[PDB]
C-alpha cells in the first residue's frame, strides 16, 4: 500500500467511449484527441491480437505526453496482458548481444496460458492415524455435506510424515503427485497445549472430498526458454543475464511446441506489448534487427517514442528523421501528440494537486498555469510540489501565490539556470 | 448358510496381517477432533506398542 505517486500516477488509464470518441479529461488524461484515439485503436488491435508484428512510433515534442500515453495505454490494456517497458540504452549489455537483448525483451512480452486439469481432494482431517514401525495409516477426510475414509499408502504416510497434519486442518491434496498443502485449521488444539495459538479458517467445500476437473490455467511468457538453455534455469530467470543460449533447437523447437500445444488445445497465445522509450538510442544495429524481427509470428505489438526530428542513427553518421533509419520508419506508422494549449495545462495541473491531495487558490492555479506554459509542464508539477511543502511548513491550508512565486525563485528552470549561467563556471 | 456360502464367492483380515507382518514395537501417532458448527479442538494421542519404545 506504501508507494509513492510518480510523475505519471495521475494517468489511470486511457478515457474512451463505447464509439472510442476521445474526451475532454477523463481517467487522468486531458486534450490531445487525436494522439488518445490513436492510442484507443492501437489498444484494441493489440487486444484482439489477430494480426502479428505491427508498430507505432509515438512522435512529438518535449512534455506533450508520450510517456503519459504510453503509461496510459499500459494501464488500459489492465494484468492478463504482458506489457513490456524498456528503456533504448537497455539492450546494452556486456554478456549477451544487443540482438539477443532484442529477442529476450521480444518473447518476454508474449504469453501462453497452458490449461492443466487437476483432481485436488480436500477436506478437514478428522482422524490421521499413522502406525509408525519406528506403514499403515488412514486419513479421514470430513466436508460440510459428507464424509469418508482413506486407506494411505507407505509414501503417502511419509509425505504426510513430511508436512506436519494435525486433526482439524484444512488440507488440499493433489491426487495426481499428492503434494501436501494446507491451508489452515478449523479449530483449536485441546486448549491446553501452552503453545501454537492461531486462528480458525472457513470450513471445506461440501463436495471437497474429491474434486474431478479442477482447471488451473498456468500462465508463463515466450521467456521459458530460460527453462531450456541451461540445466539450473532459476539463476537465468532471477539474476544471471548471462544467457547466450544457442538460438537453435531452443527457439524454433519452443515455437513448434506452442503451436503444437495451441492446436492441440493445452495452451492459448496471448501476444503483449513491448513499448521501447527513446528508442533513438538504439544502434543501427538493432533498427536492423528490429526490422526483419517484427516479421516473425509471435512479434508482439512494437510501441515507440521519439523525442526529435531530423537526428544522426546512432552507430553511423548519415541523419535520419526520428533518428530511426528510413527502412523502420516508414514500415511504421508514426502518431504525432500536439503541444498542450493553457486550458488543458490548468485542467493537467489540477489534475496532478489532486492525485498529490493539495490544494491551491485561483490565482495560484492561473499563475501556475502561465508559468508552466512558459516553461514547462513537468516543472509546473515540480512547482506544485514545492509550494505545497512551503505552504505546509507555513502552517497554511492552501497554496496562495505568495508560496509558488517564492518557490519559483528558490527553484530555477533551465532558461533561468543558462541565463545565470554568463559567469562562465567551466567548459 | 448354503445361500451365505454361495454369495461369499475382507479388509479386515487384510487390516490384521499387516499387523501380524508388524514387528511388535510399533508407535501410533493419532490425533483425533474432541469437543471443548459445534464447538471442538483437536487431541494427540500415541501410542507405544511396548515398553521398549
Ligand atoms: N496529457 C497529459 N496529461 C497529464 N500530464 C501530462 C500530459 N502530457 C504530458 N504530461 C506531463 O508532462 C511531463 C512530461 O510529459 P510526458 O507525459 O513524459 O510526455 P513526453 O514523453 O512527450 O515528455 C510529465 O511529467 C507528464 O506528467
Same mark, same amino acid.
Given at each position: 500500500r506504501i508507494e509513492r505517486i510518480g510523475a505519471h500516477s495521475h494517468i489511470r488509464g486511457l478515457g474512451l467511449d463505447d464509439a472510442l470518441e476521445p474526451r475532454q479529461a477523463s481517467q487522468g488524461m486531458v486534450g490531445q484527441l487525436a494522439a488518445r484515439r490513436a492510442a484507443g485503436v492501437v489498444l484494441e488491435m493489440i487486444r484482439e491480437g489477430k494480426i502479428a508484428g505491427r508498430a507505432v512510433l509515438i512522435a512529438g515534442q518535449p512534455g506533450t505526453g508520450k510517456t503519459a500515453i504510453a503509461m496510459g495505454m499500459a494501464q488500459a490494456l489492465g494484468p492478463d496482458t504482458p506489457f513490456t517497458a524498456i528503456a533504448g540504452s537497455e539492450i %546494452?549489455? &556486456?554478456?549477451? $548481444?544487443?540482438? @539477443?537483448?532484442?529477442?529476450?525483451?521480444? =518473447? =518476454?512480452? !508474449?504469453?501462453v496460458r497452458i490449461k492443466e486439469e487437476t483432481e485436488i481432494i480436500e477436506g478437514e482431517v478428522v482422524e490421521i492415524q499413522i502406525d509408525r514401525p519406528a506403514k499403515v495409516g488412514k486419513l479421514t477426510l470430513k466436508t460440510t455435506e459428507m464424509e469418508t475414509i482413506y486407506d494411505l499408502g507407505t509414501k503417502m504416510i511419509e509425505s504426510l510424515t513430511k508436512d506436519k497434519v494435525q486433526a482439524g486442518d484444512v488440507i488440499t491434496i493433489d491426487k495426481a503427485t499428492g503434494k501436501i498443502s494446507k491451508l489452515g485449521r478449523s479449530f483449536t488444539r485441546?486448549?491446553?497445549?501452552?503453545?501454537?495459538? $492461531?486462528?480458525?479458517?472457513?470450513?471445506?467445500?461440501?463436495? /471437497?472430498? *474429491?474434486?474431478?476437473?479442477? @482447471? #488451473?490455467?498456468?500462465?508463463?511468457? &515466450?521467456? @521459458?526458454?530460460?527453462? !531450456?538453455?541451461?540445466?539450473?534455469? /532459476? %539463476? *537465468?530467470? *532471477?539474476?544471471?543475464?548471462?544467457?547466450?543460449?544457442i538460438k537453435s533447437e531452443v527457439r524454433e523447437q !519452443?515455437?513448434?511446441? #506452442?503451436? +503444437?500445444? =495451441? +492446436?492441440? /488445445?493445452?495452451? @492459448?497465445i496471448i501476444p503483449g506489448v513491448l513499448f521501447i522509450d527513446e528508442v533513438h538510442m538504439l544502434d543501427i544495429e538493432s533498427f536492423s534487427f528490429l526490422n526483419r524481427a517484427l516479421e516473425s509470428d509471435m512479434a508482439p505489438v512494437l510501441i515507440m517514442a521519439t523525442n526529435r526530428g531530423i537526428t544522426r542513427i546512432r552507430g553511423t553518421s548519415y541523419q535520419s528523421p526520428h533518428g530511426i533509419p528510413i527502412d523502420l520508419l516508414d514500415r511504421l506508422l508514426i502518431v504525432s501528440t500536439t503541444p498542450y494549449s493553457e486550458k488543458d495545462t490548468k485542467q493537467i495541473l489540477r489534475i496532478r494537486c489532486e492525485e498529490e491531495d493539495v490544494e491551491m487558490s485561483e490565482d495560484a492555479y492561473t499563475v501556475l498555469t502561465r508559468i508552466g506554459l512558459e516553461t514547462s509542464l513537468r516543472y509546473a508539477i515540480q512547482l506544485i510540489t514545492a509550494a505545497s511543502l512551503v505552504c505546509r511548513k507555513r502552517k497554511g491550508t492552501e497554496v496562495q501565490v505568495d508560496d509558488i512565486k517564492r518557490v519559483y525563485s528558490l527553484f530555477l528552470d533551465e532558461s533561468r539556470s543558462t541565463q545565470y549561467m554568463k559567469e562562465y563556471q567551466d567548459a | 448358510n448354503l445361500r451365505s456360502l454361495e454369495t461369499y464367492e475382507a479388509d479386515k483380515k487384510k487390516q490384521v496381517h499387516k499387523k501380524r507382518k508388524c514387528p511388535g514395537p510399533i508407535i501410533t501417532y493419532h490425533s483425533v477432533t474432541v469437543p471443548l458448527p459445534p464447538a471442538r479442538c483437536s487431541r494427540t494421542f500415541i501410542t507405544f506398542s511396548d515398553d521398549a519404545t
Open positions: %546494452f549489455s &556486456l554478456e549477451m $548481444s544487443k540482438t @539477443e537483448a532484442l529477442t529476450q525483451a521480444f =518473447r =518476454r512480452s !508474449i504469453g485441546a486448549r491446553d497445549y501452552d503453545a501454537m495459538g $492461531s486462528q480458525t479458517k472457513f470450513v471445506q467445500c461440501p463436495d /471437497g472430498e *474429491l474434486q474431478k476437473r479442477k @482447471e #488451473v490455467v498456468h500462465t508463463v511468457s &515466450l521467456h @521459458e526458454i530460460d527453462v !531450456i538453455n541451461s540445466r539450473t534455469q /532459476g %539463476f *537465468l530467470a *532471477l539474476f544471471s543475464g548471462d544467457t547466450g543460449e !519452443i515455437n513448434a511446441k #506452442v503451436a +503444437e500445444w =495451441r +492446436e492441440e /488445445g493445452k495452451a @492459448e | -
